[PDB]
Protein backbone atom coordinates (compact mmCIF):
# COMPACT_ATOMS: atom_id res chain seq x y z
CA UNK A 1 0.00 0.00 0.00
CA UNK A 2 1.26 3.46 -1.00
CA UNK A 3 0.00 6.34 1.14
CA UNK A 4 0.47 10.11 1.07
CA UNK A 5 0.91 12.27 4.16
CA UNK A 6 0.27 16.00 3.97
CA UNK A 7 1.46 18.16 6.87
CA UNK A 8 0.55 21.84 7.11
CA UNK A 9 2.57 23.42 9.91
CA UNK A 10 3.41 26.81 11.38
CA UNK A 11 5.56 28.20 8.57
CA UNK A 12 5.28 25.63 5.78
CA UNK A 13 3.92 22.37 4.40
CA UNK A 14 5.53 18.99 3.75
CA UNK A 15 4.34 16.04 1.67
CA UNK A 16 5.62 12.49 2.11
CA UNK A 17 4.55 9.74 -0.28
CA UNK A 18 5.51 6.42 1.26
CA UNK A 19 5.62 2.89 -0.12
CA UNK A 20 5.29 0.68 2.95
CA UNK A 21 6.10 -2.70 1.40
CA UNK A 22 9.31 -1.25 -0.03
CA UNK A 23 9.97 1.10 2.90
CA UNK A 24 10.90 3.72 0.31
CA UNK A 25 9.58 7.28 0.08
CA UNK A 26 9.77 10.71 -1.53
CA UNK A 27 9.47 14.04 0.30
CA UNK A 28 8.67 17.53 -1.01
CA UNK A 29 8.25 20.94 0.64
CA UNK A 30 6.52 24.32 0.36
CA UNK A 31 7.46 27.36 2.44
CA UNK A 32 4.78 29.81 3.56
CA UNK A 33 5.18 33.59 3.74
CA UNK A 34 5.03 35.28 7.15
CA UNK A 35 2.10 37.49 6.17
CA UNK A 36 -0.90 37.15 3.85
CA UNK A 37 -4.15 38.92 3.01
CA UNK A 38 -5.43 35.51 1.95
CA UNK A 39 -4.09 32.51 3.89
CA UNK A 40 -6.71 30.16 2.41
CA UNK A 41 -5.27 30.83 -1.05
CA UNK A 42 -1.76 30.29 0.30
CA UNK A 43 -2.74 26.94 1.81
CA UNK A 44 -4.70 25.72 -1.20
CA UNK A 45 -1.90 26.63 -3.60
CA UNK A 46 0.54 24.91 -1.26
CA UNK A 47 -1.64 21.82 -1.62
CA UNK A 48 -1.44 21.86 -5.42
CA UNK A 49 2.28 22.68 -5.24
CA UNK A 50 2.96 19.67 -3.02
CA UNK A 51 0.95 17.37 -5.29
CA UNK A 52 2.73 18.70 -8.38
CA UNK A 53 6.26 18.14 -7.06
CA UNK A 54 5.51 14.45 -6.45
CA UNK A 55 6.72 12.31 -9.40
CA UNK A 56 4.11 10.88 -11.79
CA UNK A 57 4.97 7.31 -10.74
CA UNK A 58 4.19 7.90 -7.07
CA UNK A 59 1.05 9.90 -7.83
CA UNK A 60 -0.29 7.05 -9.97
CA UNK A 61 0.46 4.65 -7.11
CA UNK A 62 -1.03 6.64 -4.21
CA UNK A 63 -4.09 4.86 -2.82
CA UNK A 64 -4.74 6.83 0.37
CA UNK A 65 -4.22 10.43 1.51
CA UNK A 66 -4.41 12.13 4.91
CA UNK A 67 -3.81 15.71 6.06
CA UNK A 68 -2.67 17.14 9.39
CA UNK A 69 -2.91 20.84 10.22
CA UNK A 70 -2.28 23.34 12.99
CA UNK A 71 -4.60 22.95 15.99
CA UNK A 72 -6.90 25.93 16.48
CA UNK A 73 -6.63 27.34 12.96
CA UNK A 74 -10.22 27.59 11.76
CA UNK A 75 -12.15 28.90 8.76
CA UNK A 76 -15.67 30.31 8.64
CA UNK A 77 -17.06 28.98 5.37
CA UNK A 78 -20.45 28.84 3.66
CA UNK A 79 -22.26 25.87 2.11
CA UNK A 80 -19.56 25.36 -0.53
CA UNK A 81 -16.66 25.70 1.91
CA UNK A 82 -15.88 29.21 0.71
CA UNK A 83 -14.09 31.48 3.26
CA UNK A 84 -16.45 34.22 4.47
CA UNK A 85 -13.84 35.93 6.64
CA UNK A 86 -10.14 35.72 7.49
CA UNK A 87 -9.12 32.49 9.25
CA UNK A 88 -8.50 32.70 12.99
CA UNK A 89 -5.01 31.27 13.39
CA UNK A 90 -3.87 28.88 16.12
CA UNK A 91 -1.90 31.52 18.01
CA UNK A 92 -4.63 34.17 18.02
CA UNK A 93 -6.60 34.54 21.24
CA UNK A 94 -10.19 35.78 21.35
CA UNK A 95 -11.55 38.47 23.71
CA UNK A 96 -14.61 36.45 24.74
CA UNK A 97 -16.02 35.33 28.09
CA UNK A 98 -15.21 31.65 28.67
CA UNK A 99 -18.29 31.55 30.91
CA UNK A 100 -20.30 31.76 27.68
CA UNK A 101 -19.03 28.29 26.78
CA UNK A 102 -19.72 26.64 30.15
CA UNK A 103 -23.02 25.01 29.13
CA UNK A 104 -21.57 23.40 26.00
CA UNK A 105 -18.67 21.44 27.52
CA UNK A 106 -17.85 19.88 30.91
CA UNK A 107 -16.04 21.58 33.82
CA UNK A 108 -12.52 22.13 32.49
CA UNK A 109 -12.81 20.76 28.97
CA UNK A 110 -9.98 21.60 26.55
CA UNK A 111 -12.32 23.83 24.52
CA UNK A 112 -12.36 26.23 27.47
CA UNK A 113 -9.52 28.36 26.15
CA UNK A 114 -9.41 31.76 24.44
CA UNK A 115 -7.45 30.17 21.59
CA UNK A 116 -9.69 27.13 21.03
CA UNK A 117 -11.78 26.49 17.91
CA UNK A 118 -14.97 26.76 19.98
CA UNK A 119 -13.97 30.12 21.46
CA UNK A 120 -13.22 31.38 17.96
CA UNK A 121 -16.57 30.11 16.69
CA UNK A 122 -18.28 31.98 19.53
CA UNK A 123 -16.17 35.03 18.69
CA UNK A 124 -17.37 34.83 15.08
CA UNK A 125 -20.90 34.37 16.42
CA UNK A 126 -20.75 37.58 18.45
CA UNK A 127 -19.07 39.26 15.47
CA UNK A 128 -21.50 38.45 12.66
CA UNK A 129 -24.35 38.60 15.17
CA UNK A 130 -26.02 35.54 13.70
CA UNK A 131 -24.33 32.79 11.69
CA UNK A 132 -26.33 31.13 8.88
CA UNK A 133 -27.08 27.41 9.53
CA UNK A 134 -25.75 26.36 6.12
CA UNK A 135 -22.37 27.79 7.10
CA UNK A 136 -19.59 25.63 8.53
CA UNK A 137 -16.50 26.03 10.70
CA UNK A 138 -13.53 24.05 9.40
CA UNK A 139 -10.12 23.34 10.88
CA UNK A 140 -7.15 23.77 8.55
CA UNK A 141 -6.84 20.02 7.99
CA UNK A 142 -10.61 19.83 7.48
CA UNK A 143 -10.72 22.57 4.85
CA UNK A 144 -7.75 21.14 2.96
CA UNK A 145 -9.10 17.58 2.87
CA UNK A 146 -12.36 19.16 1.67
CA UNK A 147 -10.41 20.37 -1.36
CA UNK A 148 -9.71 16.69 -2.06
CA UNK A 149 -12.95 14.81 -1.37
CA UNK A 150 -15.51 17.63 -1.65
CA UNK A 151 -17.46 16.44 1.39
CA UNK A 152 -18.38 19.41 3.57
CA UNK A 153 -18.54 19.58 7.38
CA UNK A 154 -16.17 16.65 7.94
CA UNK A 155 -13.60 16.48 10.73
CA UNK A 156 -11.75 14.19 13.15
CA UNK A 157 -11.86 13.85 16.94
CA UNK A 158 -8.38 15.34 17.28
CA UNK A 159 -9.08 18.67 15.58
CA UNK A 160 -12.65 18.67 16.88
CA UNK A 161 -11.58 18.27 20.52
CA UNK A 162 -10.99 21.98 21.09
CA UNK A 163 -14.19 22.69 19.18
CA UNK A 164 -16.06 21.06 22.05
CA UNK A 165 -16.08 17.40 21.05
CA UNK A 166 -15.98 14.75 23.76
CA UNK A 167 -14.03 11.75 22.39
CA UNK A 168 -14.61 9.94 25.70
CA UNK A 169 -18.30 9.77 24.80
CA UNK A 170 -17.73 10.24 21.05
CA UNK A 171 -20.11 13.20 20.73
CA UNK A 172 -20.67 16.94 20.93
CA UNK A 173 -22.83 17.89 23.91
CA UNK A 174 -26.57 17.92 23.29
CA UNK A 175 -26.71 21.53 24.48
CA UNK A 176 -24.08 22.55 21.92
CA UNK A 177 -25.79 20.71 19.07
CA UNK A 178 -29.13 22.24 20.06
CA UNK A 179 -27.44 25.64 20.11
CA UNK A 180 -27.23 28.25 17.40
CA UNK A 181 -23.68 27.04 16.70
CA UNK A 182 -24.88 23.46 16.24
CA UNK A 183 -25.50 23.66 12.50
CA UNK A 184 -21.91 24.80 11.89
CA UNK A 185 -20.38 21.83 13.70
CA UNK A 186 -18.88 19.05 11.54
CA UNK A 187 -19.52 15.31 11.50
CA UNK A 188 -16.65 13.82 13.48
CA UNK A 189 -14.82 10.67 12.38
CA UNK A 190 -11.80 8.75 13.63
CA UNK A 191 -8.48 9.94 12.16
CA UNK A 192 -7.42 7.64 9.33
CA UNK A 193 -10.83 6.32 8.28
CA UNK A 194 -11.87 6.97 4.69
CA UNK A 195 -14.18 9.96 4.30
CA UNK A 196 -14.76 9.45 0.60
CA UNK A 197 -13.04 8.99 -2.77
CA UNK A 198 -10.92 11.79 -4.22
CA UNK A 199 -12.77 14.24 -6.48
CA UNK A 200 -12.81 12.94 -10.10
CA UNK A 201 -11.62 16.28 -11.49
CA UNK A 202 -8.81 16.46 -8.92
CA UNK A 203 -7.75 12.85 -9.54
CA UNK A 204 -7.68 13.42 -13.30
CA UNK A 205 -5.81 16.73 -13.14
CA UNK A 206 -2.97 15.50 -10.91
CA UNK A 207 -2.72 12.03 -12.43
CA UNK A 208 -4.02 10.31 -9.31
CA UNK A 209 -6.08 7.12 -9.25
CA UNK A 210 -9.80 8.00 -9.23
CA UNK A 211 -10.21 5.26 -6.61
CA UNK A 212 -7.85 7.00 -4.18
CA UNK A 213 -9.34 7.55 -0.72
CA UNK A 214 -9.18 10.74 1.33
CA UNK A 215 -8.99 9.93 5.04
CA UNK A 216 -9.81 11.91 8.18
CA UNK A 217 -6.77 13.91 9.27
CA UNK A 218 -5.12 14.95 12.54
CA UNK A 219 -3.18 17.77 14.14
CA UNK A 220 0.51 18.20 13.31
CA UNK A 221 1.33 17.72 17.00
CA UNK A 222 -0.32 14.29 16.99
CA UNK A 223 1.04 13.39 13.55
CA UNK A 224 4.52 13.94 15.00
CA UNK A 225 3.81 11.33 17.68
CA UNK A 226 2.38 8.92 15.10
CA UNK A 227 5.66 9.26 13.21
CA UNK A 228 7.50 7.57 16.09
CA UNK A 229 5.60 4.30 15.69
CA UNK A 230 4.92 3.93 19.42
CA UNK A 231 1.55 2.27 20.03
CA UNK A 232 1.85 0.50 23.39
CA UNK A 233 0.58 2.35 26.49
CA UNK A 234 3.35 3.65 28.75
CA UNK A 235 5.45 4.62 25.74
CA UNK A 236 6.31 8.30 25.44
CA UNK A 237 7.82 10.67 22.90
CA UNK A 238 9.95 13.48 24.31
CA UNK A 239 10.59 16.51 22.12
CA UNK A 240 13.83 18.22 23.12
CA UNK A 241 13.34 21.33 21.00
CA UNK A 242 13.11 25.03 21.84
CA UNK A 243 10.64 23.92 24.49
CA UNK A 244 10.40 20.49 26.08
CA UNK A 245 7.21 18.80 24.92
CA UNK A 246 6.19 15.49 26.49
CA UNK A 247 3.70 13.06 24.94
CA UNK A 248 2.66 9.99 26.91
CA UNK A 249 0.48 7.14 25.65
CA UNK A 250 -1.95 5.81 28.26
CA UNK A 251 -4.94 3.55 28.90
CA UNK A 252 -6.47 6.39 30.89
CA UNK A 253 -7.44 9.94 30.01
CA UNK A 254 -5.91 12.51 32.36
CA UNK A 255 -6.33 16.27 32.55
CA UNK A 256 -5.15 19.28 34.55
CA UNK A 257 -6.35 22.69 33.33
CA UNK A 258 -3.93 24.40 35.72
CA UNK A 259 -0.88 22.96 33.96
CA UNK A 260 -2.63 22.81 30.59
CA UNK A 261 -2.60 19.02 30.57
CA UNK A 262 -5.30 17.21 28.60
CA UNK A 263 -5.78 14.00 26.62
CA UNK A 264 -6.48 13.13 22.99
CA UNK A 265 -8.31 9.95 22.06
CA UNK A 266 -6.09 7.56 20.10
CA UNK A 267 -7.88 4.39 19.03
CA UNK A 268 -8.58 2.43 22.19
CA UNK A 269 -5.89 4.40 24.02
CA UNK A 270 -5.25 8.00 25.07
CA UNK A 271 -2.43 10.40 24.22
CA UNK A 272 -1.72 12.83 27.05
CA UNK A 273 1.07 15.35 27.42
CA UNK A 274 2.50 18.61 28.68
CA UNK A 275 4.70 21.46 27.49
CA UNK A 276 7.30 23.27 29.60
CA UNK A 277 8.67 26.77 29.06
CA UNK A 278 12.13 25.28 29.59
CA UNK A 279 14.08 23.85 26.67
CA UNK A 280 16.97 24.30 24.27
CA UNK A 281 16.16 28.00 23.95
CA UNK A 282 17.67 28.44 27.42
CA UNK A 283 20.80 26.66 26.18
CA UNK A 284 21.15 28.98 23.17
CA UNK A 285 20.99 31.97 25.53
CA UNK A 286 24.49 31.05 26.71
CA UNK A 287 25.96 28.96 23.87
CA UNK A 288 25.97 28.59 20.09
CA UNK A 289 25.42 24.99 18.91
CA UNK A 290 29.05 24.38 17.99
CA UNK A 291 30.32 25.55 21.38
CA UNK A 292 27.41 23.67 22.95
CA UNK A 293 28.79 20.49 21.39
CA UNK A 294 32.49 21.07 22.12
CA UNK A 295 31.54 21.55 25.78
CA UNK A 296 29.13 18.60 25.99
CA UNK A 297 32.06 16.35 25.09
CA UNK A 298 33.69 17.15 28.42
CA UNK A 299 30.69 16.34 30.62
CA UNK A 300 30.63 13.15 32.69
CA UNK A 301 26.96 12.40 33.56
CA UNK A 302 27.97 9.87 36.24
CA UNK A 303 28.88 12.71 38.61
CA UNK A 304 26.49 15.39 39.88
CA UNK A 305 27.58 18.97 39.20
CA UNK A 306 26.22 20.13 42.55
CA UNK A 307 24.07 22.58 40.62
CA UNK A 308 20.29 22.71 40.98
CA UNK A 309 19.02 24.85 38.11
CA UNK A 310 15.54 25.52 36.80
CA UNK A 311 16.27 26.55 33.20
CA UNK A 312 13.44 28.91 32.24
CA UNK A 313 14.13 31.25 29.29
CA UNK A 314 12.21 33.95 31.16
CA UNK A 315 9.70 34.55 33.95
CA UNK A 316 6.84 32.04 34.07
CA UNK A 317 6.25 28.29 33.98
CA UNK A 318 3.21 26.21 32.98
CA UNK A 319 4.32 22.56 33.29
CA UNK A 320 5.03 20.27 35.17
CA UNK A 321 4.10 22.79 37.88
CA UNK A 322 2.31 26.05 37.08
CA UNK A 323 3.84 29.31 38.33
CA UNK A 324 3.65 32.50 36.23
CA UNK A 325 5.88 34.29 38.74
CA UNK A 326 8.62 31.66 38.80
CA UNK A 327 11.97 33.04 37.71
CA UNK A 328 14.83 31.17 36.04
CA UNK A 329 17.22 29.66 38.59
CA UNK A 330 20.78 29.72 37.28
CA UNK A 331 22.82 30.29 40.46
CA UNK A 332 25.48 29.63 41.60
CA UNK A 333 27.19 29.97 38.22
CA UNK A 334 30.62 28.27 38.13
CA UNK A 335 33.51 29.71 36.12
CA UNK A 336 33.77 26.46 34.14
CA UNK A 337 31.44 26.63 31.11
CA UNK A 338 31.44 22.82 30.98
CA UNK A 339 29.98 22.40 34.46
CA UNK A 340 27.53 25.25 33.95
CA UNK A 341 26.29 23.43 30.87
CA UNK A 342 25.96 20.26 32.94
CA UNK A 343 23.88 22.18 35.47
CA UNK A 344 21.64 23.28 32.61
CA UNK A 345 21.24 19.78 31.18
CA UNK A 346 20.56 18.47 34.70
CA UNK A 347 17.84 21.07 35.14
CA UNK A 348 16.23 20.26 31.80
CA UNK A 349 16.45 16.59 32.74
CA UNK A 350 14.58 17.32 35.96
CA UNK A 351 11.86 19.13 34.02
CA UNK A 352 11.27 16.04 31.87
CA UNK A 353 11.49 13.70 34.86
CA UNK A 354 9.04 15.71 36.97
CA UNK A 355 6.88 16.13 33.88
CA UNK A 356 6.33 12.43 33.27
CA UNK A 357 5.88 11.79 36.99
CA UNK A 358 3.26 14.55 37.15
CA UNK A 359 1.45 12.87 34.25
CA UNK A 360 1.53 9.51 36.04
CA UNK A 361 0.33 11.13 39.28
CA UNK A 362 -2.73 12.35 37.37
CA UNK A 363 -3.52 8.73 36.49
CA UNK A 364 -1.66 8.09 33.25
CA UNK A 365 -0.10 4.70 32.54
CA UNK A 366 3.39 4.41 34.14
CA UNK A 367 6.31 5.15 31.82
CA UNK A 368 7.75 2.12 30.01
CA UNK A 369 10.22 3.72 27.59
CA UNK A 370 10.96 7.02 25.86
CA UNK A 371 11.47 7.92 22.20
CA UNK A 372 13.28 11.23 21.77
CA UNK A 373 12.88 13.94 19.14
CA UNK A 374 14.12 17.49 18.63
CA UNK A 375 17.61 18.96 18.66
CA UNK A 376 18.63 17.57 22.03
CA UNK A 377 17.82 13.99 21.02
CA UNK A 378 21.34 13.52 19.65
CA UNK A 379 22.92 14.77 22.89
CA UNK A 380 24.11 11.52 24.49
CA UNK A 381 25.24 13.24 27.70
CA UNK A 382 21.76 14.72 28.01
CA UNK A 383 20.37 11.28 27.16
CA UNK A 384 22.42 9.68 29.94
CA UNK A 385 21.20 12.23 32.47
CA UNK A 386 17.60 11.67 31.37
CA UNK A 387 18.01 7.89 31.46
CA UNK A 388 19.58 7.61 34.92
CA UNK A 389 17.10 10.09 36.41
CA UNK A 390 13.94 8.62 34.88
CA UNK A 391 14.77 4.91 34.90
CA UNK A 392 13.42 3.75 31.55
CA UNK A 393 15.11 2.87 28.24
CA UNK A 394 15.59 6.03 26.18
CA UNK A 395 16.32 6.05 22.46
CA UNK A 396 16.09 8.31 19.42
CA UNK A 397 12.75 8.24 17.59
CA UNK A 398 13.16 6.41 14.23
CA UNK A 399 11.05 9.02 12.43
CA UNK A 400 9.91 12.46 13.59
CA UNK A 401 8.39 14.18 10.55
CA UNK A 402 4.68 14.96 10.94
CA UNK A 403 4.00 14.25 7.27
CA UNK A 404 5.38 10.73 7.67
CA UNK A 405 3.17 10.06 10.68
CA UNK A 406 0.22 11.24 8.63
CA UNK A 407 1.32 8.97 5.80
CA UNK A 408 1.22 6.11 8.31
CA UNK A 409 -2.18 7.40 9.40
CA UNK A 410 -3.41 7.12 5.83
CA UNK A 411 -1.88 3.67 5.33
CA UNK A 412 -2.92 2.01 8.59
CA UNK A 413 -5.17 4.39 10.54
CA UNK A 414 -5.22 4.13 14.33
CA UNK A 415 -5.59 0.34 14.25
CA UNK A 416 -2.35 -0.32 16.15
CA UNK A 417 -3.76 1.52 19.16
CA UNK A 418 -5.78 -1.35 20.63
CA UNK A 419 -5.33 -4.44 22.80
CA UNK A 420 -3.34 -7.03 20.86
Numbering used by the authors: 2 to 421
What's the publication's text?
Our results suggested that three conserved residues (D8, T11 and D221 of SePSK) play an important role in SePSK function. To identify the function of these three residues of SePSK, we constructed D8A, T11A and D221A mutants. Using enzymatic activity assays, we found that all of these mutants exhibit much lower activity of ATP hydrolysis after adding D-ribulose than that of wild type, indicating the possibility that these three residues are involved in the catalytic process of phosphorylation D-ribulose and are vital for the function of SePSK. Three conserved residues in SePSK were identified to be essential for this function.
The At2g21370 gene product from Arabidopsis thaliana, xylulose kinase-1 (AtXK-1), whose mature form contains 436 amino acids, is located in the chloroplast (ChloroP 1.1 Server). SePSK and AtXK-1 display a sequence identity of 44.9%, and belong to the ribulokinase-like carbohydrate kinases, a sub-family of FGGY family carbohydrate kinases. Domain I exhibits a ribonuclease H-like folding pattern, and is responsible for the substrate binding, while domain II possesses an actin-like ATPase domain that binds cofactor ATP.
